[PDB]
Design a protein around this ligand. Structure first.
Ligand SMILES: [Zn+2]
Lengths: 123, 64
């Protein structure tokens, strides 16, 4: 609860890579929910395709997925690690995907104290 | 005589699940193409209905 909730999706998507629980992509992200084991999913607001959000929210609605609203496509993809970092720490080429799903949470308490508490008040 | 070099490159639509998944305003998820009955591509991976058949992406099955 010490940190902001839109900057609290950092470490859960870091630990989404330690088991490769981040089903990166869109078709793979669509089939991630088709087997019904994903815990959380987020979405980028920057979409050229308006009906794409209607596709993904249809599966996020009836299969009990809670969502976090993030504004930018290319900002969202760096939590996978898809940005090509330089030797001094600059992302000289960033890949952004608008469907980031998770399959396993991290092993801590500093992540689910703010994300899940922000999830309980929208119920 | 002449060197005939060719390779079938792939051409992908803009996130081609929109060709598979259709959702209307009521919110029901309608998939037009065939779902493969095989288990390794079950319930998430779809076939593509062609002009005389369907075709799976994993087990390459055909129909009529
Ligand atoms: Zn298969």
């Amino acid at each position: 609860g010490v940190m902001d909730v839109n900057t609290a999706l950092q470490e859960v998507l870091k630990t989404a890579l330690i088991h490769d629980g981040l089903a990166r992509g869109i078709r793979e992200a669509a089939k991630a929910l088709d087997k019904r084991q994903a815990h959380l999913c987020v979405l980028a607001s920057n979409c050229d395709e308006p009906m794409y959000v209607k596709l993904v929210e249809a599966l996020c609605a009836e299969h009990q997925i809670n969502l976090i609203k993030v504004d930018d496509n290319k900002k969202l993809g760096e939590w996978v690690g898809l940005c090509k970092i330089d030797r001094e720490g600059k992302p000289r080429k960033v890949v952004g995907c608008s469907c980031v799903v998770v399959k396993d949470y991290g092993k801590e308490s500093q992540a689910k104290d703010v994300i899940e508490e922000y999830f309980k008040c929208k119920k | 005589t002449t060197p005939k070099k060719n390779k079938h490159k792939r051409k992908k639509v803009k996130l081609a699940v929109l060709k598979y998944y259709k959702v209307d305003e009521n919110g029901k998820i309608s998939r037009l193409r065939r779902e493969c009955p095989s288990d390794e591509c079950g319930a998430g991976v779809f076939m593509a209905s062609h002009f005389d058949r369907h075709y799976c992406g994993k087990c390459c099955l055909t129909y009529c």
